[PDB]
Every structure is written in C-alpha cells, then in structure tokens.
Amino acid sequence: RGSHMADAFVGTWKLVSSENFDDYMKEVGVGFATRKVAGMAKPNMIISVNGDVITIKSESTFKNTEISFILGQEFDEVTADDRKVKSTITLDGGVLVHVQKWDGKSTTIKRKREDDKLVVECVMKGVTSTRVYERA
Template sequence: DSANFDEYMKAIGIGFAMRQIGSVTKPTLIISAEGDHVTLKTTSTFKNMEWNFTLGEEFDETTADERKTKSTFTVDGDKLVQVQRWEGKETTISRAVSGDSMVATCSIGDVVCA
C-alpha cells in the first residue's frame, strides 16, 4: 500500500471514481529491455497497458486514466525514472525492484507518494 497515493492522484487531476479504482488496483508490471529499447506492460483487473519506448527519448503516452502526456524514461542507478508532462504539469515516477516487488515513488509539486 502506498502512503499518500490518494493525494497524489488528486494532484494529477484524477477524479473521485478513478481514484477509488486506483486505490485498490494492484497491477503486475513486466519490464523487458533490449539495449535502450524497453517494453513495459501492466496487467490488472482494471486495465492492461503496454508502452514501447527508447530510454531518453520523449514519446506520446495515454495513461490508464486517459491523460495525454509526453513521457520520457531514463535509468538512474537501479531505478527506472519516468517524467510525464501535460497541460503545464509535470510528475516523476521512480520505480525500483526490491526482491519480487516493485517500489514506486511518485511526485508532483510538493506531493510525494511512496
């Protein structure tokens, strides 16, 4: 369970109903890479998503909550870092693997969810 996740979802503009779904959804994340090309897949009871991208290159992303963003992924040590930009907003999502779990830290402005 992520502390402050509801506040984070509010800050990025997700409405009440989608926040309720988001708070109980536990997606499975599969990351595969070949050089700088990465495929990231999420599966859940709510929605399945797949992104194909090249590290360091901005691409158009439609998020699970239907936001249209410009996203860039980079690697920082053992973390996969994603920056999403849309409508003058910017959020950073940092993902790291710990054992068989992924730990994500999300931030927008002074709102941080870990």
C-alpha cells in the same frame, strides 16, 4: 547482445503495498470515480527488454497499459487515468526516472530495485506515493 542495465527490472511483479496513492492522484487531477476504482487495483507489472527497447506492461481490473521506449527518447503515453502525456524515461544511477508532462503540469515516477522488491515512487508537487511490488 549481453546483459542490459535495465535487466534488474525485468520480470513479473505484483503490487503488495501502496501509501498515499489517493493523495497523489488528487494532486495529478484524477477525478473522483477514477481515483476510487484505480485505487482499488492491485496491478501486475511485466517489464521486458529487447535490445534498446524497454517495455512496461501493467495488467489490472482497472486498465491494461503498455509502454515501449528507448532511454532518453521522448514518447507519447496514454496513462491509466487517460491523460495524454509526453514522457521521457532515463536511467540515473540504477533508478528508472519517468517524467510525464501535460497541460503545463509534470509528474515523476521513479522505479528502483530494493532487496527483492521493485519500489515505485510517484511525485507530484510535494505529494509522494510509494508503491511496492514483489516478484509474482
């Protein structure tokens, strides 16, 4: 197999900045103690592609998570804050768009390459958090 469109995301990334993430978690419904501990985390993100399967791992002092998925195909995900959600991830003009649905709620996580950074935009009902990763 040759190059994949998600290949621009492949690599090991480290969180270098975060804005409004506490407010975002509040809007998602995250409880106090989880918000405080999760907000301290400086996770590493490891993204790989094998054929049609994309894997995104997050390693931190808070939790280690891993999702593997095929674009456009819904899957089960247990989030770092231990929500049990139904997730679909697609590629839209070079942006990975991740929708999570649970308990009649929805949130959208967009991951995009900007310069040498991986920028993560987390949106819930008007609240947006921007998390910036650099190569590790």
